[PDB]
């Protein structure tokens, strides 16, 4: 396989379907890529993340550059090994959770200073050690480090954020390209930001377009601003991109949130699933998602979902999982997120043959008639 | 298959290896039973349990009749059905438990009363519901309903529960045969008490012979006694039980516990793998055992064990699986249970092919050699 290539094969209205190919293995898209966190996707072992569909997972760098370590990992023969996923992983770049889950975080020009969470432990991130870090994680898919903008936004504020992170971008891909293992094997993908305005996103795309990445992401969505608004900069925002390269709508989400992110052009998802206040035990359907805790379904002899082709649905009933979740087992979240990764998956198939059948938007229509009866 | 029939195919001293036929499957002797609380074997689903090797599982009665409820899982088809695992269980009667996880524990002659440690909610437990409540369940061995004797314990009150204990297990007795479902299909242990006196021990034995049952287990140690003085306890007490039906040593336990068990004419074991003050880190190796979390294997790439044929040691490193443990991740808990079960199973069978062998006397000195060294 090539080092990168991505191939259309099929398109309804602004939806496609297609491929990546990698050194790795062939990614099909529309993609939803399953979290690792900690060199792990919660509860699996990678032969079930592999038998639920996924052809790609994501790996957190922020938690791995804390523990057990980039340089570490590199040590030991890199993350696709010691985790025992041998298909593409993409990285992020770690500047998010900086954000969201350290402390005293110190913000410049250079990058971000930050005191591990876990630890006291002090510690650094700029494009140039981000990128390296995905280097040494083995990363196939690798992220530009950027600046996240909070919604809301000022206009000043999104403008300035957004300038510095298309300066990262160029950092980023001068410090991925001074890396001939990297350069040769890997891809890197580059992030839009511009919060919700439609100049500052252009701007921004029109940035990015001239460095030059092997994908582009849509950054700074899924921060607040409901389903209505990030449907409305998607209208917007993804044809900005360049049409013949992979857009990727990083963190999202819902089912319904990606059936609408493909019909405006989206091409891969991720994100991580619920687990307070009892979401760990909510389950998604066809009919729409349930929450298995329910009293209601202490005796429920179906499965998760009456169509799923899942090994959970096969095999155990609503009630024996309910029992499970509600007694805290180990196999209550093994099981959970193995339907509802594998949900995900059937769920992507069913968008990439709609497409490739020319009835997606019929798919769509039926999908969120039954989903919200 | 016949309803029971334990039958010895190879002997070297005391020790025996054999089969118990039984509705759901066969059982090789001496056999580890790996245990299921709440319905679970910790963090495994069943095909993976069986995948270990193991025969038969062991039902913790005390928590499924808390949660989920007997009777619901009756309704939902029994225990095998609920969970999936369609081979042989053995159930406990659920009255060690009452005792050392319930609270407001009222104890007489008819039963014992208690509150539920997970709830207020106040249950009972006698002989005859004891019965009732693994007849529900659906289990294959049933145990019958005893009074355990605390460590140390005078003559006079070790006497008192086991008399008490015999009285029970023809209370047990009669509760099984009266309900014609459960006499044709399932067996029914009786247990031994009596504590560390002979005389007891001897009694209780032919109280139980007088009886009948179909196996006999040794109840009443591994309850702070120390080794030497199990063993020297099992020396005198297996002899007095009837020869030509197994014998099982309740809640026993390492691995080298268990072969000189079984040098002394123990036929099936159960125990829960410890968890408290970072033991769920404890790995079995031939070598003896390690604590994954020692920083010492942060970078070691050997499996758990070098010569363990489980697929956990085929795929991850003690360096993966290290961080996993430390990161308090869920497959952290999954690797090192399909592990240290593997590796119990493997024991047991290389305890069952030396005994058909007639080297199992130089296996025992082999194995302690190379465990404790
Ligand atoms: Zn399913
Ligand atoms: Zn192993």
């Avoid at 099909?28 to 966190?37: C, N, S, Y």
Wanted: hydrophobic letters at 40%; a neutral charge; one cysteine or more.
């Amino acid at each position: 396989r090539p080092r990168f290539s991505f191939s259309i094969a099929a398109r309804e209205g602004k939806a496609r379907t297609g491929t990546i190919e990698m050194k790795r293995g062939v990614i099909r898209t529309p993609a939803f890529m399953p979290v690792g966190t900690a060199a792990t996707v919660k509860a699996l072992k990678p032969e079930t993340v592999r038998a639920t569909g996924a052809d790609i997972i994501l790996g957190n760098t922020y938690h791995l550059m804390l523990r057990p370590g980039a340089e570490r990992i590199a040590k030991l023969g890199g993350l696709h090994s010691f985790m025992g996923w041998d298909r593409p992983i993409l990285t992020d770049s770690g500047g998010y959770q900086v954000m969201s889950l350290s402390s005293l975080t110190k913000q410049s020009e250079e990058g971000v200073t930050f005191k591990s969470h876990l630890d006291g432990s002090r510690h650094m991130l700029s494009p140039e050690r981000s990128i390296e870090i995905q280097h040494l994680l083995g990363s196939d898919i690798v992220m530009a480090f950027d600046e996240c903008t909070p919604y809301p936004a000022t206009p000043s504020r999104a403008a300035s954020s957004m300038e510095r992170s298309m300066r990262w971008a160029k950092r980023s891909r001068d410090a991925f390209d001074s890396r001939k293992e990297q350069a040769e094997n890997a891809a890197l993908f580059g992030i839009q930001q511009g919060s919700v305005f439609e100049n500052l996103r252009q701007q921004s795309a029109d940035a990015l377009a001239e460095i030059g990445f092997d994908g582009y992401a849509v950054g700074g969505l899924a921060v607040g601003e409901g389903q209505d608004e990030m449907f409305r900069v998607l209208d917007f925002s993804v044809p900005m991109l360049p049409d013949d390269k992979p857009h990727y709508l990083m963190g999202v989400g819902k089912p319904d949130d990606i059936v609408g992110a493909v019909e405006r052009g989206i091409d891969m998802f991720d994100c991580v699933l619920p687990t307070r206040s009892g979401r760990n035990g909510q389950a998604f359907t066809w009919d729409g998602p349930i929450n298995i805790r329910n009293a209601r379904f202490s005796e429920d002899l179906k499965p998760l979902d009456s169509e799923c082709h899942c090994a959970v649905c096969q095999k155990w009933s609503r009630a024996y999982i309910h029992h499970l979740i509600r007694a805290g087992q180990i196999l209550g979240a093994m099981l959970m997120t193995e339907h509802n990764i594998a949900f995900y998956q059937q769920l992507m198939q069913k968008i990439r043959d709609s497409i490739s059948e020319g009835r997606f938007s019929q798919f769509a229509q039926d999908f969120r008639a039954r989903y919200f009866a």
